[PDB]
């Protein structure tokens, strides 16, 4: 199932390497330690509506 099942639990980009899920993130984000979540490096990361 992998990427096809709920985006492989990735926050953003998902692809399959050797039959396993690999997550990655847009520029301005860093992959979290769990290898799934994407963490913004600045105050205005791309794709976020501005609130603060």
């Amino acid at each position: 199932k992998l990427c096809s099942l709920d985006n492989g639990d990735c926050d953003q980009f998902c692809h399959e390497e050797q039959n396993s899920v690999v997550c990655s993130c847009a520029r301005g984000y860093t992959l979290a330690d769990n290898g799934k979540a994407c963490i913004p490096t600045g105050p205005y990361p791309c794709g976020k509506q501005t609130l603060e």
Binding site: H15, Y44, K48
Partner: protein, 234 residues
């Protein structure tokens, strides 16, 4: 935009507006980074000398967060033709960097394969702009956004009087009165995935607006991701 709603504070921070020497908006754009705007190639003919305004929601008032940026380099896809409206895409390098803030921030560029199978297979995307609120109306003074369904590609080509190329996709409604319109051209079509908004399209053209049996035609960003990447190093 016909129908839909006003972008509320901070809601559409990646929207840019191409303004002519009379300081009026004629087309939209999407903020890609501090130096780069994405818009449509056909917009480059809609004025002789233009600049890019960001952070604006209401063109009748100076809200305070607005900034105008001169265009340093125009990068127009050399395959674009008014005959076909294929390859309707351009990137603009700005002379000065955009400072991100309330109502000013980039949309994400997705990866191709992921975007194709995950973003464009969602129900809908979001288009925004200052364009006409009716096919015969004037430009909007307020920034608007509209949720628009992705349209099946077969249905898309049947509905069209013009050849829908592989660089184009349809979005909108069969009959409901919601659509993009003249003046929205060049602007953002974005798709949401877990509260993060990725650029998926460029408002391109349409047989009038909100018309029965007709959809909005958008430039398929995923087919130009490599090209965009290269333009952003130019």
């Amino acid at each position: 935009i016909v129908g839909g709603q006003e972008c509320k504070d901070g809601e559409c921070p990646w929207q840019a507006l191409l303004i002519n020497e009379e300081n009026e908006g004629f087309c939209g754009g999407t903020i890609l980074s501090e130096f780069y705007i994405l818009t449509a190639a056909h917009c480059l003919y809609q004025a002789k000398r233009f600049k890019v305004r960001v952070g604006d929601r209401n063109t009748e008032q100076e809200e305070g967060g607005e900034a105008v940026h001169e265009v340093e380099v125009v990068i127009k896809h050399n395959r674009f033709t008014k005959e076909t409206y294929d390859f309707d895409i351009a990137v603009l390098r700005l002379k000065t960097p955009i400072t991100f803030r309330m109502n000013v921030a980039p949309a994400c560029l997705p990866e191709r394969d992921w975007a194709e199978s995950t973003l464009m297979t969602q129900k809908t995307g979001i288009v925004s702009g200052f364009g006409r609120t009716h096919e015969k109306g004037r430009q909007s003074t307020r920034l608007k956004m509209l949720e628009v369904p992705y349209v099946d590609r077969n249905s898309c080509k049947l509905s069209s009087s013009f050849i829908i190329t592989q660089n184009m996709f349809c979005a909108g409604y069969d009959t409901k009165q919601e659509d993009a319109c003249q003046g929205d051209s060049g602007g953002p079509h974005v798709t949401r995935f877990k509260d993060t908004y990725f650029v998926t399209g460029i408002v391109s053209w349409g047989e009038g607006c909100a018309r029965k049996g007709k959809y909005g035609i958008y430039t398929k960003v995923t087919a130009f991701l490599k090209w965009i990447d290269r333009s952003m190093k130019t």
